[model samples]
Target chain A: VLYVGSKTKEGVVHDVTTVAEKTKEQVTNVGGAVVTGVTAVAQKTVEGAGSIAAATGFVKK
Target chain B: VLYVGSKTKEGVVHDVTTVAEKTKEQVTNVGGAVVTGVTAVAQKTVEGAGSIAAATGFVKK
Candidate 1:
């Protein structure tokens, strides 16, 4: 005999969904910070490369 | 200036999705176990009530 607790299923799904949504939000926030850091590093690297090129007379000032 | 870095965005979303999916799966499994426990307890309570009723002559043998 199948004891189908549909209400229990609904509550469980709701709780799981809430946790999943919150977790994704937190992860996305952290990922945004990581992306920002990576971008800043890349920008600095590009600026440094340009300075090196100008100093070596490889590019016009 | 907008530095999109679409590739980074893709990676971040993928990671967040993976974690969310895994978390939901785990939570669902736990919820299933909880439901099982609740059902077991409810079954026991019903059986106990039936026995009590029979012992008290409230229910026919």
Candidate 2:
């Protein structure tokens, strides 16, 4: 009594491969989002610091 | 001493939205993978059943 003979195995394998590919795409997008989010935070911090310094300079002069 | 003034908030909001969009995209891909995987399994099962039936017929004949 063979369970899931060769033809069925082929279909299952193909599907598993597709799922793997899709998962890879998900990971890639998530990774990109993380990288971009961190970079944006850094960028925003710099801009915030600049604005603070600029305001301080204006008040003193 | 105000922290993260309007400009900083603006930048933060933009980045947050971008991250959200990317996350949404990631979820979509994952959902697609699950749907495809399930469909594939169903199709494979049917094919497997057919193969078993065919084998039985051949053996009997």
Which candidate wins on lDDT? Answer: 2
Worst 10 residues of 2 chain A by lDDT: A51-60
Candidate 2 lDDT, tens digit per residue, A1-61?
3433232222211212211222223432111121111111112112112111000001111
Residue-by-residue lDDT tens digits, candidate 2, B1-61: 2333222222111212111222223322110121111211112112112111010101111
Report residue B51 deviation for candidate 1 (angstroms). Answer: 72
Top-scoring candidate (DockQ): 2
CA shift at B14, candidate 1, in angstroms? 17
Worst 10 residues of 2 chain B by lDDT: B51-60
Native-to-model Cα distance after best TM-score fit, residue B27 in candidate 1, in Å? 22
**What does candidate 2 score on TM?**
0.13
lDDT of 1 by residue, B1-61 (tens): 2333322111111111111234221221110111001110011112112111000101111
Task: Considering only chain B, report the TM-score of model 2.
Answer: 0.10
lDDT of model 1 at residue A46? 20
